[PDB]
């Protein structure tokens, strides 16, 4: 019977290849009394989840640790429930702890986390995301993505609505229906603008897979109205963090698809609850992420493969140097492929914690 | 034209005279962050907010980073008169962390009042200087609970907020003891802090009906997000139902109003992120015919003064402002006279009148 006898945290900062419109992460290490160690890594994206590195560090060390230390690994579901009830929000802090527990559970069975969760397949396709910009600049960026082998393109909108509308014209004459578009407004549109955008799209011949979070996260009425109006799948992102949020958008029919992110759910256990609710309601799920470390991408990919989720916006790997992830992931665009025979997730903190 | 040229903070830790226990947590202390904004004319203004992680998710460490590294660049160099625009732009950079926002909003109000040579209460339009509070009673076994209530009554409190929701069997059995021990000149407010399910809540209300008690409110009996159960309880109950954790901000207020999920909202500055957002809630509630009370976390007297100033300006007379009763008198005696159960603002204070710098070392 293994018990968790130690918890450490470390701050990890990673540079981005370009500016997006660095990554701050907290890593946590849990140590069993048999010597096995497990790791989880979460982003501090304050504008979205409200997490800060400083808050996460305090919460893990002073709040979660007293609950976790001395507890049996096999009691993890209860331990995490007890720990998490002491903290409102701070979902990224919860993610880090949840992931480290799964890392331990897998290592105790000498298998990968993906395998622990029931995955067989090793590979998932991601879109590439395109930052907000002027139409011309945006066409170039998309072209670069296509040349890089991506056929699914996430285009950021909502900053300049006229630009978003003009862009569709430019898109229609420069791209075939072999290129598949995903529009993500990040809450930037009102109800009327959203309806306009959808109509504009249909003025053209374009392959558009989804419209993501067009309005404010709390305007569930507008989401439900946009969903009924739309001939294109509507995705809830910020409208759904957790299972109770999922229940609300299901009950109010406010989306066709839920974008599950581990940094919103507070890790894998809660993400599994959302998927189960969505399955029962005939609502589809995709996975997404913050602009976060490859470790978070690997965890998210592991969850998706276990859950039969094939739609993914996992692009941050494209924003960072290959050598960061090359130990556990082969990115042959646009495929994210888990390496064989990893124990747990397969990443280690030696350079951060030890060297 | 005054510009904000400096922002500094300090942690405050205060011991409680007795243990505060709710269905959610137990504590002997208050952790708070204070913030100081300095104008280019040398005038300084202050706000103080609690780190109640189990409730608002705030931590001293998070608040510190948010205020000094996120909010500060937006605030620094800006004109005081631009406060509404500055706060809107700064706050949109941060999801949640409502207490960090409260600290900043309060310091801005302190400056606005000081620049007019008046109190914040005056700035907001208060006429009255006095508000009555209940005293709240920690969860415990029946006998301890009766004793704590007796202590409150002898201290002159006639409105008693009884925490419930930790042990449902105890909550039900307590109602018997209350009926025996106290007259109807004592008014009870029950607060479950989300600890009951729907069936238990109805049973508790049914149970109250079995006795003769003066019961003013039933506060947040179920989970903050179970708005359906809140609406069902509100429709079922002959006692006004109060939303606390279900309402942080104006959009939360809109939802509970639209869903008929409460009769009254408990406004707390640590949830609203300060006075500006609290005013918006009050306006929405007034339009909907929903009443408001003010409340607080177990937090420093500075937050109590700020909250009382707001209530007085908004004609809110129902208050759970008790933390003064849990801490040393000298922590509030600079700005407040507490003649239990009356919170009385001292006269002629400029801004809030917290007098923090005397005892705290503020740092950039």
XYZ file of C-alpha atoms in Angstrom:
719
model
C 0.000 0.000 0.000
C 1.731 3.108 -1.326
C 1.266 6.477 0.411
C 2.255 9.954 -0.778
C 5.045 11.190 1.505
C 6.368 14.272 -0.308
C 5.224 17.151 -2.532
C 7.438 19.661 -4.329
C 6.655 22.439 -6.769
C 8.720 24.187 -9.404
C 8.115 27.121 -11.725
C 8.860 26.487 -15.387
C 9.033 29.235 -17.993
C 9.295 28.450 -21.703
C 9.905 30.883 -24.573
C 7.566 30.985 -27.574
C 8.952 30.973 -31.130
C 6.800 34.019 -31.780
C 4.357 36.434 -30.119
C 0.789 35.186 -29.786
C -2.382 37.285 -29.662
C 6.417 32.870 -23.036
C 4.529 30.230 -21.080
C 4.284 30.288 -17.285
C 3.773 26.841 -15.736
C 3.848 25.326 -12.284
C 5.001 21.752 -11.983
C 4.250 19.522 -9.054
C 6.032 16.344 -7.985
C 4.429 13.767 -5.722
C 6.630 11.106 -4.100
C 5.366 7.729 -2.887
C 6.984 5.937 0.042
C 8.195 3.273 -2.434
C 10.243 5.910 -4.278
C 8.005 6.272 -7.342
C 7.548 9.931 -8.348
C 4.855 11.517 -10.480
C 4.475 14.858 -12.140
C 1.851 17.250 -13.345
C 2.290 20.585 -15.082
C -0.321 23.352 -15.446
C -0.408 26.875 -16.992
C -1.102 30.051 -15.073
C -3.425 31.786 -17.493
C -4.853 34.441 -15.231
C -7.147 36.088 -17.780
C -8.974 32.791 -18.323
C -8.795 30.556 -15.224
C -7.669 33.187 -12.678
C -4.665 31.041 -11.739
C -1.330 32.619 -10.871
C 1.948 30.784 -10.262
C 2.081 32.340 -6.792
C -1.471 31.293 -5.886
C -0.988 27.774 -7.265
C 2.215 27.343 -5.272
C 0.570 28.466 -2.016
C -2.541 26.348 -2.600
C -0.587 23.175 -3.351
C 1.902 23.581 -0.508
C -0.367 24.923 2.249
C -3.862 23.686 1.394
C -3.669 20.528 -0.696
C -0.468 19.140 0.866
C -1.836 18.567 4.399
C -4.692 16.554 2.885
C -2.511 14.538 0.506
C 0.519 13.805 2.681
C 0.315 10.426 4.413
C -2.710 9.342 2.356
C -2.970 6.061 0.425
C -2.519 6.342 -3.336
C -5.511 3.993 -3.805
C -7.777 6.559 -2.037
C -6.992 9.253 -4.641
C -10.601 9.914 -5.659
C -11.530 10.672 -2.050
C -8.289 12.517 -1.326
C -8.759 14.803 -4.298
C -12.401 15.455 -3.451
C -11.390 16.409 0.101
C -8.505 18.590 -1.107
C -10.416 20.379 -3.878
C -13.382 21.284 -1.684
C -11.038 23.578 0.249
C -10.452 25.809 -2.790
C -12.925 27.697 -4.992
C -11.720 28.191 -8.618
C -7.937 27.917 -9.170
C -8.647 25.108 -11.614
C -5.070 25.062 -12.944
C -3.722 24.337 -9.454
C -6.128 21.368 -9.320
C -5.015 20.234 -12.761
C -1.375 20.000 -11.633
C -2.253 17.774 -8.670
C -4.725 15.593 -10.642
C -2.139 14.973 -13.370
C 0.589 14.026 -10.866
C -1.793 11.498 -9.302
C -2.458 9.926 -12.712
C 1.265 9.853 -13.397
C 1.698 7.890 -10.137
C -1.196 5.527 -10.891
C 0.246 4.665 -14.290
C 3.811 4.251 -13.053
C 2.556 1.923 -10.313
C 1.231 -0.286 -13.123
C 4.331 0.218 -15.289
C 2.235 1.683 -18.114
C 1.640 5.056 -19.786
C -1.096 7.395 -18.559
C -2.842 6.980 -21.956
C -2.866 3.225 -21.398
C -4.011 3.624 -17.783
C -6.972 5.648 -19.042
C -7.832 2.939 -21.594
C -6.324 4.363 -24.782
C -5.025 2.046 -27.537
C -4.424 4.531 -30.374
C -1.349 6.801 -30.116
C -2.082 9.656 -32.509
C -4.293 12.718 -32.716
C -4.738 15.435 -35.319
C -4.543 19.095 -34.288
C -5.455 22.295 -36.087
C -3.030 25.194 -36.261
C -4.168 28.479 -34.717
C -3.800 31.900 -36.333
C -3.461 35.042 -34.186
C -5.659 38.071 -34.807
C -4.374 40.382 -37.539
C -5.273 42.329 -40.668
C -6.758 40.300 -43.530
C -3.575 40.269 -45.635
C -1.396 39.258 -42.690
C -3.930 36.577 -41.783
C -4.050 35.023 -45.258
C -0.253 34.705 -45.231
C -0.300 33.058 -41.797
C -2.921 30.566 -42.952
C -0.950 29.860 -46.115
C 2.110 29.102 -43.989
C 0.028 26.642 -41.984
C -1.209 24.858 -45.090
C 2.347 24.700 -46.431
C 3.288 23.167 -43.073
C 0.765 20.370 -43.708
C -2.133 21.477 -41.463
C -5.567 21.074 -43.070
C -7.581 22.255 -40.052
C -7.142 25.937 -39.331
C -8.255 27.713 -36.191
C -8.722 31.368 -37.026
C -8.920 33.823 -34.122
C -11.689 36.390 -34.567
C -13.633 38.839 -32.397
C -11.071 41.627 -32.101
C -12.164 43.535 -35.207
C -15.561 42.498 -36.545
C -15.272 44.207 -39.913
C -11.956 42.443 -40.399
C -13.598 39.117 -39.495
C -16.299 39.761 -42.117
C -13.862 40.914 -44.821
C -11.648 37.902 -44.103
C -14.325 35.449 -45.270
C -14.258 36.918 -48.770
C -10.476 36.569 -48.810
C -10.792 33.022 -47.492
C -13.330 31.943 -50.110
C -11.220 32.986 -53.097
C -7.867 31.729 -51.718
C -8.796 28.284 -50.298
C -10.508 25.047 -51.323
C -12.913 22.980 -49.236
C -9.991 20.694 -48.456
C -8.993 23.343 -45.919
C -11.270 23.098 -42.885
C -11.867 26.232 -40.788
C -12.585 26.657 -37.072
C -13.538 30.175 -35.992
C -12.919 31.122 -32.371
C -14.258 34.524 -31.356
C -13.117 34.289 -27.734
C -16.400 35.895 -26.593
C -15.743 38.945 -28.800
C -19.024 39.075 -30.739
C -22.508 40.097 -29.726
C -25.522 38.069 -30.803
C -26.163 40.156 -33.926
C -22.557 40.127 -35.118
C -22.445 36.353 -34.674
C -25.569 35.884 -36.797
C -24.083 38.173 -39.455
C -20.860 36.187 -39.505
C -22.699 32.920 -39.997
C -24.810 34.390 -42.799
C -21.692 35.850 -44.437
C -20.024 32.426 -44.303
C -22.989 30.916 -46.125
C -22.666 33.578 -48.841
C -19.596 31.597 -49.844
C -18.293 28.119 -50.435
C -16.198 27.336 -47.385
C -15.645 24.284 -45.262
C -16.374 25.470 -41.712
C -16.299 22.834 -38.984
C -17.109 24.965 -35.931
C -17.934 28.359 -34.484
C -16.377 28.585 -31.026
C -17.588 30.675 -28.043
C -18.995 33.581 -30.094
C -20.458 35.444 -27.082
C -19.791 36.055 -23.358
C -19.245 32.892 -21.288
C -22.234 33.698 -19.078
C -24.737 34.508 -21.784
C -26.211 31.077 -22.048
C -29.417 32.428 -23.579
C -27.492 33.921 -26.502
C -25.456 30.716 -26.919
C -28.676 28.690 -27.075
C -30.147 31.091 -29.636
C -26.974 31.046 -31.757
C -26.941 27.257 -31.556
C -30.524 26.944 -32.842
C -29.937 29.585 -35.521
C -26.623 28.131 -36.726
C -26.131 25.563 -39.491
C -22.587 25.212 -38.178
C -21.575 23.398 -34.987
C -21.355 25.793 -32.039
C -18.661 25.111 -29.457
C -18.744 26.125 -25.807
C -15.295 26.900 -24.413
C -15.342 29.410 -21.530
C -19.032 28.584 -20.961
C -17.879 25.127 -19.759
C -15.125 24.603 -17.165
C -16.601 21.740 -15.159
C -19.333 19.083 -15.047
C -21.933 21.440 -13.540
C -21.243 23.951 -16.347
C -21.703 21.097 -18.820
C -25.056 20.209 -17.216
C -26.194 23.798 -17.699
C -25.294 24.067 -21.390
C -26.861 20.641 -21.990
C -30.045 21.588 -20.133
C -30.316 24.915 -21.979
C -29.196 23.474 -25.325
C -26.492 26.145 -25.590
C -23.933 24.288 -27.752
C -23.435 21.347 -30.101
C -19.962 20.568 -28.804
C -17.937 21.170 -25.626
C -14.298 22.165 -25.746
C -12.720 20.313 -22.811
C -9.518 21.783 -21.377
C -7.714 20.220 -18.420
C -6.752 23.686 -17.132
C -10.490 24.533 -16.888
C -11.640 21.140 -15.544
C -8.962 20.915 -12.886
C -7.581 17.751 -14.456
C -8.579 14.357 -15.774
C -11.151 13.214 -13.180
C -13.439 16.175 -13.816
C -12.851 16.043 -17.595
C -14.082 12.414 -17.565
C -17.279 13.544 -15.815
C -17.958 16.126 -18.546
C -17.402 13.567 -21.344
C -19.842 11.152 -19.689
C -22.526 13.862 -19.372
C -21.979 15.009 -22.957
C -22.161 11.428 -24.264
C -25.522 10.907 -22.524
C -26.878 14.142 -24.001
C -25.716 13.436 -27.550
C -23.347 16.407 -27.288
C -19.905 16.013 -28.900
C -16.588 16.926 -27.243
C -13.288 18.267 -28.528
C -10.087 18.925 -26.582
C -8.235 22.214 -26.434
C -5.612 23.811 -24.245
C -4.235 27.129 -23.087
C -0.990 28.275 -24.618
C 0.801 25.842 -22.412
C 3.687 23.452 -22.042
C 4.050 20.268 -24.135
C 3.528 18.343 -20.885
C -0.026 19.690 -20.720
C -0.505 18.820 -24.387
C 0.662 15.251 -23.724
C -1.738 14.908 -20.809
C -4.590 16.300 -22.908
C -3.770 14.042 -25.864
C -3.680 11.033 -23.492
C -7.163 11.913 -22.221
C -8.573 12.446 -25.714
C -7.209 9.122 -27.005
C -8.783 7.346 -24.047
C -12.119 9.081 -24.593
C -12.400 8.708 -28.385
C -12.150 12.463 -28.891
C -10.736 13.130 -32.371
C -11.208 16.897 -32.744
C -8.333 18.756 -31.091
C -6.843 22.229 -30.923
C -3.430 21.318 -29.526
C -1.214 23.707 -31.533
C 1.080 25.071 -28.770
C 3.598 22.391 -29.752
C 4.030 24.482 -32.906
C 4.914 27.524 -30.800
C 7.822 25.918 -28.917
C 11.151 24.207 -29.652
C 11.016 20.530 -30.619
C 13.610 19.454 -28.033
C 11.241 20.325 -25.207
C 8.830 17.517 -26.139
C 10.845 15.177 -28.392
C 11.285 12.692 -25.554
C 7.546 11.890 -25.324
C 5.975 13.209 -28.535
C 6.585 13.123 -32.266
C 4.873 16.024 -33.949
C 4.660 15.244 -37.640
C 2.251 17.963 -38.604
C -0.532 17.871 -38.144
C -0.214 14.645 -36.142
C 0.656 14.503 -32.465
C 1.994 11.012 -31.806
C 2.811 9.615 -28.373
C 6.099 7.745 -28.190
C 6.084 4.021 -27.361
C 6.634 2.527 -23.921
C 6.589 5.673 -21.793
C 6.054 5.090 -18.074
C 3.454 7.484 -16.687
C 3.426 10.561 -18.919
C 7.095 10.097 -19.742
C 8.410 13.566 -18.932
C 10.719 14.263 -15.980
C 11.664 17.425 -14.068
C 15.388 16.746 -13.539
C 16.589 19.948 -15.245
C 14.159 22.133 -13.279
C 14.194 20.414 -9.870
C 17.650 18.818 -9.730
C 20.062 20.416 -12.191
C -5.827 66.495 -11.861
C -4.284 63.887 -9.584
C -2.398 60.866 -10.969
C -1.710 57.544 -9.231
C 2.084 57.286 -8.994
C 2.652 54.400 -6.602
C 1.066 51.113 -5.531
C 2.173 49.227 -2.433
C 0.810 46.349 -0.374
C 1.040 44.765 3.057
C -0.245 41.517 4.517
C -2.396 41.701 7.670
C -2.950 38.727 9.970
C -5.502 38.932 12.770
C -6.263 36.322 15.444
C -9.902 35.498 16.260
C -11.075 35.430 19.901
C -12.926 32.198 19.239
C -13.098 29.539 16.530
C -15.246 30.287 13.482
C -16.726 27.123 12.029
C -19.085 26.815 9.084
C -20.136 23.914 6.873
C -17.291 24.923 4.526
C -14.300 25.418 6.815
C -12.950 26.214 10.269
C -10.529 28.996 11.223
C -8.910 30.891 14.083
C -7.540 33.789 12.048
C -8.011 36.247 9.196
C -5.488 36.662 6.372
C -5.867 39.957 4.465
C -3.984 41.996 1.895
C -3.981 45.799 2.200
C -3.194 48.004 -0.778
C -2.017 51.624 -0.800
C -2.392 53.918 -3.820
C -0.340 57.130 -3.752
C -1.417 60.245 -5.720
C 1.153 62.658 -7.175
C -0.022 65.218 -4.593
C 0.974 62.837 -1.807
C -2.542 61.793 -0.765
C -2.786 58.045 -0.045
C -5.736 55.678 -0.242
C -6.312 52.198 1.084
C -8.294 49.046 0.627
C -8.235 45.789 2.559
C -9.569 42.427 1.371
C -9.639 38.898 2.834
C -7.996 35.858 1.296
C -10.814 33.361 1.702
C -9.621 30.653 -0.604
C -12.462 28.219 0.095
C -15.016 30.853 -0.920
C -13.633 33.351 -3.480
C -10.503 31.392 -4.419
C -8.323 34.341 -3.421
C -4.901 33.870 -1.830
C -2.578 36.557 -0.403
C 0.075 35.425 -2.874
C -2.241 35.566 -5.887
C -3.682 38.942 -4.820
C -0.174 40.287 -4.354
C 0.920 39.238 -7.845
C -2.310 40.405 -9.467
C -2.267 43.813 -7.842
C 1.440 44.544 -8.235
C 2.125 42.933 -11.629
C -1.200 42.875 -13.493
C -3.343 45.768 -12.256
C -0.447 48.118 -11.442
C 0.746 48.842 -15.027
C -2.818 49.796 -15.930
C -3.294 51.977 -12.833
C 0.135 53.640 -12.590
C 0.344 57.010 -14.325
C -3.432 57.199 -14.751
C -5.685 60.104 -13.665
C -7.803 59.511 -10.554
C -10.842 60.794 -12.465
C -10.401 57.947 -14.960
C -11.047 55.369 -12.228
C -14.072 53.725 -13.876
C -12.235 53.134 -17.180
C -9.038 52.102 -15.434
C -10.781 49.520 -13.231
C -12.757 48.111 -16.165
C -9.608 47.645 -18.276
C -7.565 46.272 -15.372
C -10.245 43.869 -14.133
C -10.766 42.358 -17.565
C -7.192 41.009 -17.374
C -8.139 38.742 -14.477
C -10.785 36.046 -14.203
C -12.153 35.566 -10.655
C -9.882 36.769 -7.794
C -12.704 39.044 -6.667
C -10.986 39.913 -3.373
C -7.897 41.298 -5.153
C -10.326 43.492 -7.081
C -12.122 44.585 -3.902
C -8.833 45.829 -2.449
C -8.197 48.062 -5.466
C -11.763 49.355 -5.809
C -11.780 50.340 -2.110
C -8.470 52.212 -2.340
C -9.876 54.172 -5.274
C -12.949 55.147 -3.246
C -10.711 56.150 -0.353
C -8.875 58.530 -2.737
C -12.064 59.903 -4.305
C -13.446 60.804 -0.849
C -10.158 62.166 0.483
C -9.833 64.410 -2.587
C -13.255 65.877 -1.697
C -12.328 66.136 1.995
C -15.241 63.860 2.988
C -15.785 60.280 4.252
C -16.440 57.467 1.773
C -19.896 57.087 3.328
C -20.526 60.780 2.550
C -19.115 60.403 -0.980
C -21.557 57.567 -1.650
C -24.505 59.594 -0.370
C -25.062 58.114 3.072
C -27.280 60.030 5.496
C -27.369 57.686 8.499
C -24.186 56.643 10.359
C -25.449 53.524 12.149
C -26.286 49.988 11.078
C -27.398 46.970 13.102
C -25.672 43.603 12.738
C -26.467 40.101 13.874
C -23.826 37.986 15.530
C -23.058 34.641 13.900
C -22.650 31.342 15.749
C -20.181 28.618 14.747
C -21.345 25.110 13.927
C -21.105 22.869 16.981
C -23.113 20.474 19.122
C -26.427 21.709 20.496
C -25.112 22.606 23.963
C -22.089 24.615 22.763
C -24.363 26.357 20.257
C -26.932 27.386 22.855
C -24.115 28.743 25.033
C -22.625 30.804 22.202
C -26.084 32.220 21.453
C -26.601 33.053 25.120
C -23.232 34.815 25.015
C -24.446 36.855 22.041
C -27.720 37.777 23.730
C -25.970 38.935 26.921
C -23.715 41.024 24.688
C -26.916 42.681 23.385
C -27.308 41.048 19.954
C -30.943 40.247 19.206
C -30.425 38.978 15.662
C -28.596 35.679 15.658
C -27.123 34.038 12.588
C -26.923 30.314 13.239
C -24.534 28.399 11.000
C -25.967 25.057 9.872
C -25.252 22.532 7.151
C -22.319 20.635 8.693
C -24.482 18.119 10.550
C -28.109 17.916 9.415
C -29.210 15.805 12.369
C -27.798 18.478 14.709
C -29.480 21.296 12.763
C -32.881 19.602 13.178
C -32.335 18.907 16.896
C -31.114 22.446 17.559
C -34.516 23.860 16.573
C -35.975 22.163 19.644
C -33.397 23.773 21.923
C -33.832 27.223 20.366
C -37.596 27.047 20.933
C -37.033 26.254 24.629
C -34.239 28.726 25.339
C -35.208 31.918 23.534
C -38.150 34.282 23.220
C -39.485 35.747 19.983
C -37.649 38.987 20.685
C -34.680 36.992 19.325
C -34.655 36.637 15.537
C -32.872 33.759 13.848
C -31.099 33.706 10.498
C -29.975 30.269 9.344
C -27.017 29.932 6.993
C -26.179 26.459 5.673
C -23.249 27.538 3.518
C -24.518 25.135 0.833
C -24.392 22.131 3.172
C -27.949 20.825 2.699
C -29.542 19.023 -0.218
C -33.004 19.949 -1.519
C -34.894 17.384 0.607
C -33.082 18.328 3.803
C -33.823 22.026 3.211
C -37.573 21.441 2.832
C -37.506 19.216 5.919
C -35.708 21.919 7.918
C -38.263 24.503 6.819
C -41.091 22.040 7.576
C -39.392 21.499 10.936
C -39.217 25.207 11.772
C -42.988 25.274 11.173
C -43.350 22.822 14.062
C -42.104 25.348 16.594
C -42.650 28.995 17.346
C -39.477 30.827 16.434
C -38.912 34.232 14.955
C -37.011 33.305 11.762
C -35.946 36.098 9.390
C -33.998 34.298 6.607
C -32.758 30.979 5.233
C -29.414 31.625 3.582
C -27.753 29.603 0.781
C -29.158 26.230 1.837
C -27.818 24.346 -1.232
C -24.849 24.356 -3.676
C -24.055 27.712 -5.294
C -24.742 26.355 -8.782
C -27.974 24.505 -8.112
C -30.178 27.337 -9.175
C -33.085 24.960 -9.830
C -33.078 23.783 -6.222
C -32.763 27.398 -5.066
C -35.808 28.329 -7.178
C -37.733 25.335 -5.818
C -36.822 26.200 -2.225
C -37.727 29.862 -2.753
C -41.178 28.855 -4.065
C -41.657 26.355 -1.218
C -40.529 28.493 1.700
C -42.635 30.910 3.768
C -39.280 32.326 4.962
C -37.273 34.646 2.686
C -34.499 32.721 0.909
C -31.107 34.433 0.614
C -28.563 33.872 -2.159
C -24.973 34.290 -0.981
C -22.478 32.047 -2.799
C -24.921 31.907 -5.744
C -24.405 35.633 -6.350
C -20.956 37.200 -6.688
C -21.569 39.769 -9.419
C -24.257 41.525 -11.482
C -24.529 38.743 -14.059
C -25.041 36.236 -11.198
C -27.755 38.532 -9.854
C -29.426 38.600 -13.286
C -29.527 34.810 -13.343
C -31.060 34.364 -9.868
C -33.609 37.068 -10.674
C -34.479 35.499 -14.045
C -34.829 32.072 -12.435
C -36.666 33.343 -9.303
C -33.993 31.651 -7.230
C -34.031 33.877 -4.124
C -36.022 36.552 -2.295
C -32.937 38.452 -1.181
C -29.291 38.798 -2.203
C -26.455 38.923 0.305
C -24.037 41.452 -1.147
C -20.384 41.144 -0.090
C -17.614 43.363 -1.392
C -15.173 40.376 -1.391
C -17.468 38.636 -3.910
C -18.364 41.717 -6.008
C -14.787 42.917 -6.345
C -15.689 46.145 -4.545
C -18.225 48.959 -4.445
C -18.720 49.646 -8.163
C -19.955 46.123 -8.901
C -21.982 46.043 -5.661
C -23.876 49.181 -6.801
C -24.789 47.404 -10.047
C -26.235 44.449 -8.174
C -28.277 46.746 -5.943
C -29.747 48.498 -9.001
C -30.757 45.213 -10.633
C -32.266 43.919 -7.392
C -34.279 47.111 -6.883
C -35.688 46.872 -10.420
C -36.663 43.239 -9.857
C -38.274 43.864 -6.462
C -35.619 41.659 -4.818
C -34.292 42.862 -1.437
C -30.593 43.107 -0.490
C -28.667 42.627 2.746
C -24.948 43.108 3.254
C -22.588 40.481 4.578
C -18.875 39.808 4.709
C -16.278 37.087 4.985
C -14.766 36.637 8.434
C -12.569 39.542 7.569
C -10.872 42.632 8.892
C -12.831 45.551 10.362
C -11.618 47.642 7.405
C -13.799 45.541 5.095
C -16.630 45.932 7.607
C -16.377 49.732 7.542
C -16.313 49.802 3.751
C -19.330 47.500 3.606
C -21.262 49.513 6.192
C -20.493 52.695 4.230
C -22.025 51.086 1.118
C -25.088 49.759 2.977
C -25.761 53.159 4.546
C -25.574 54.803 1.106
C -27.873 52.189 -0.458
C -30.489 52.123 2.311
C -29.664 48.499 3.121
C -30.544 47.831 6.752
C -30.189 44.054 7.100
C -26.565 43.228 7.873
C -24.357 40.322 8.908
C -21.309 42.445 9.796
C -20.242 40.499 12.916
C -16.426 40.079 12.548
C -15.938 43.105 14.863
C -17.240 40.834 17.648
C -14.547 38.251 16.869
C -11.492 40.516 17.101
C -9.707 42.952 19.434
C -11.556 46.270 19.794
C -8.420 48.310 19.121
C -8.399 47.013 15.564
C -11.550 49.033 14.788
C -11.713 51.795 17.455
C -9.986 54.358 15.220
C -12.978 54.349 12.823
C -15.928 52.570 14.438
C -17.906 52.605 17.652
C -19.468 49.219 18.149
C -22.282 49.538 20.654
C -23.446 46.027 20.192
C -25.244 45.408 18.081
C -24.809 48.811 16.404
C -21.980 49.632 14.056
C -21.554 53.400 14.204
C -19.262 55.308 11.879
C -17.063 57.794 13.704
C -17.459 61.429 12.635
C -15.266 63.636 10.468
C -13.108 60.891 8.986
C -11.562 61.587 5.596
C -11.896 58.681 3.188
C -12.486 55.530 5.204
C -10.162 56.589 8.034
C -8.472 53.158 8.366
C -5.233 54.601 9.729
C -3.259 51.606 8.369
C 0.181 53.081 7.703
C 0.777 53.632 11.429
C 0.866 49.871 12.025
C 1.807 48.345 8.650
C 4.846 48.599 6.429
C 3.753 49.034 2.807
C 6.042 47.803 0.023
C 6.124 48.110 -3.773
